[PDB]
């Protein structure tokens, strides 16, 4: 585990992370996809061998010795707010299980269901709070990756508010 487990936020491409493993914001079919998923496909294409997994689950595939945790959040275009919220919570609980199983001291993680799976809503707070519910009992250093300058400020403020 980390000596003093922390949360941090960085505004940059998660394919350039400095952590011991990465969480892909995957689609259920293990396809290259777009956004974070396409960046992850270009950087770790070997990790997409048999990476298909259902909504609300995470499936780890090794690229060399580097673990890629494919986490499948719900597309809020298709799910009801209620069922989508349950699947989004579940995906992050499965990430925490994988991070623990792998024995890593650090993980790079995007905000699941905040981009093309957001159904056109701002889900920063919803997605981040489910990330914290899952990851608070883990001892890995967590580094959250985002692309927007206003999102960076809001995530940083949310981390600092817990102290
Ligand atoms: Cl970048
Ligand atoms: Cl998304
Ligand atoms: Cl963002």
Swiss-Prot record:
It is found in: Host cytoplasmic vesicle membrane. ADP-D-ribose binds at residues 13, 27, 35, 115-117. Phosphorylated by host on serines and threonines. It is a peripheral membrane protein. Residues 4-163 form the Macro domain. Interacts with mRNA-capping enzyme nsP1. Interacts (via C-terminus) with host G3BP1; this interaction inhibits the formation of host stress granules on viral mRNAs and the nsp3-G3BP1 complexes bind viral RNAs and probably orchestrate the assembly of viral replication complexes. Interacts (via C-terminus) with host G3BP2; this interaction inhibits the formation of host stress granules on viral mRNAs and the nsp3-G3BP2 complexes bind viral RNAs and probably orchestrate the assembly of viral replication complexes. Interacts (via C-terminus) with host NAP1L1. Seems to be essential for minus-strand RNAs and subgenomic 26S mRNAs synthesis. Displays mono-ADP-ribosylhydrolase activity. ADP-ribosylation is a post-translational modification that controls various processes of the host cell and the virus probably needs to revert it for optimal viral replication. Binds proteins of G3BP family and sequesters them into the viral RNA replication complexes thereby inhibiting the formation of host stress granules on viral mRNAs. In the N-terminus, the macro domain displays a mono-ADP-ribosylhydrolase activity. The central part called, the alphavirus unique domain (AUD) has a zinc-binding function. The C-terminus region, also called hypervariable domain (HVD), is mainly disordered and binds several host proteins. This intrinsically disordered domain contains 2 SH3 domain-binding sites and 2 FGDF motifs necessary and sufficient for the formation of nsP3/G3BP complexes. This is Non-structural protein 3. It comes from Chikungunya virus (strain S27-African prototype) (CHIKV). The chain holds residues 1334 to 1493 of 2474 of the full protein.
């Amino acid at each position: 585990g980390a000596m003093a487990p922390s949360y941090r936020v960085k505004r940059m491409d998660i394919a350039k992370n400095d952590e011991e493993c990465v969480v892909n914001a995957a689609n259920p079919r293990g396809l290259p996809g777009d956004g974070v998923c396409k960046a992850v496909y270009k950087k770790w294409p070997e990790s997409f061998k048999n990476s298909a997994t259902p909504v609300g689950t995470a499936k780890t595939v090794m690229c060399g010795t580097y673990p890629v945790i494919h986490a499948v959040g719900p597309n809020f275009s298709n799910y009801t707010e209620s069922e989508g919220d349950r699947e989004l919570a579940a995906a992050y609980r499965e990430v925490a299980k994988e991070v623990t199983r792998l024995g890593v001291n650090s993980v790079a993680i995007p905000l699941l269901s905040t981009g093309v799976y957001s159904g056109g809503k701002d889900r920063l707070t919803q997605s981040l709070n489910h990330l914290f519910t899952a990851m608070d009992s883990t001892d890995a250093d967590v580094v959250i990756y985002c692309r927007d300058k206003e999102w960076e400020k809001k995530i940083s403020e949310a981390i600092q508010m817990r102290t």
